[PDB]
Amino acid sequence: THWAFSPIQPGAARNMAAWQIAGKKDGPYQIDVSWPLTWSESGDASGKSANAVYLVDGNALFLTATETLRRRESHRPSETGTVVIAIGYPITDSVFSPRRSYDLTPPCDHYIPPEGGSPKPEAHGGADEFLTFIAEIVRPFVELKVFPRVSFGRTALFGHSYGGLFALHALFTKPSSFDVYLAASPSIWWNNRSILTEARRFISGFSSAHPVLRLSFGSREQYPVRQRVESDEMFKRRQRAAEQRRMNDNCEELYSELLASGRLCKLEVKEYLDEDHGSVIGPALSGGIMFLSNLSA
Amino acid sequence: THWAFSPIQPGAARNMAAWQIAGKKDGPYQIDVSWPLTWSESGDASGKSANAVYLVDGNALFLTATETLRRRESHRPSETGTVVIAIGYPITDSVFSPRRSYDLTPPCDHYIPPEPKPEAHGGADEFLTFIAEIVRPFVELKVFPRVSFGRTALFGHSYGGLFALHALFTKPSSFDVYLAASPSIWWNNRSILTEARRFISGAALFSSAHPVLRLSFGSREQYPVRQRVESDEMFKRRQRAAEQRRMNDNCEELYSELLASGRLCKLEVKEYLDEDHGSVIGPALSGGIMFLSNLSA
Ligand SMILES: [Cl-]
Ligand SMILES: [Cl-]
Ligand SMILES: [Cl-]
Ligand SMILES: [Cl-]
Known about the structure:
binds chloride ion; siderophore; alpha/beta-hydrolase; hydrolysis; hydrolase; alpha/beta; 21% strand; homodimer
């Protein structure tokens, strides 16, 4: 047999591109963009329309969102294709950046740092700047420069942890920013639950906005399970953090408050059984993508 | 602020490569390979060992597997790194190939077409030999020659899951860990059961393999949930197909039978609530990788 191992490009990294966006003091951003496989490698959709999903912590979520959509688009070729826009950082040894703490937390009149369990201060309060950046710089670049011949129908924002907090902040203060908000394991605990002040202002008061929200969390986030290889004290640290952060109950209570207000067009909460803060990312992102695609019909 | 956009490569598609493997009767294969972000761009692990996960339907699963691992590896730098090897096809407009039907189904003396929709079938022994004797030695001896591989896993979904079970039952020493997601146990009037029975009672006295198996399925696979838009007839057709395939019960009963055999050192079955045949892929793949990483701690 004439076996040949021939290097090829792009392989599975098809119909994706990346840009650095330089200007901010903190350093450049990295945007990763992917588009449907039926479109050309130059991004030509041949007159087709699209939806779009914007991801914060872009480096950690881009590929999962891309592939989830490509599986579904393969099964359902008549469905509207979705462009993925991941907003992240020029990082090489990891998929998370410490810069996320500033970018994803909203500015507040008073600040209480997170617990390490000593106080663990980090940069904070840049969410309004970041949201402006996405809406006024990134989004128009994608729509007007990258895909000028594509009519964009539905837009979504997904974030996990501080990303979920960011998604909630966007919903409560600028509800027309996106059509759909996907807040996965949102850090509702953050800064003595300051996001609930914004939630209640949103519940009270934005006339022309009909937002959709999907909340999610892993069942183990508030109720951790000791791993096979884990020391007693390291497990007890996780128990401490879990009880303070109150992920499961904070999500369910926020869901209940928002549901009772009737201010959302559609609202859903999903508990992912047996998933923890890290392991829930894949299922919650996949689930958010499916939730988004199911809104089309 | 004067934002400066500039194209960059590779963006989030770093530490990955692809080869076309030509020679086989049916046509060329495409293998996509990714490795940890802490290793070099040329695949140098600097003496580190690794696990490996081999994926069938490679075009549809490569990026999800890759990114799931990179998220975990970023939080757990001391854990054993994992190389992803996706075995797929040179396809451009979709992530699935019709060739999968032949490659993933085992040879049988009689064939019953699935409900009637006949397909090419019976190439799984040839495909397993290809993976074991052509692909794996290329990856281990040519791509990662100084990496000592600890545990190797095989993941497949649907017909891929059937393939994973076929591999386990006929050549149990092929892989250390088998991840059979929504396996098509129903296929060809449950013809896989003949091999399952032989496996159960066929262990050698000395030096027999005791592999690891994880079974999974989505709760909606056997119990579909009606959509608003669906007619009665269209929903009834989905219910009929679900009853026939019997995904949930076949998985659970295979688990029970294999548990009683005592041939597997570790055996797990997971039902993913609210997930269907397509939506369970991400969660089951992520869950399978978590499972492999947990047993490698
Ligand atoms: Cl846990
Ligand atoms: Cl949509
Ligand atoms: Cl269903
Ligand atoms: Cl384990």
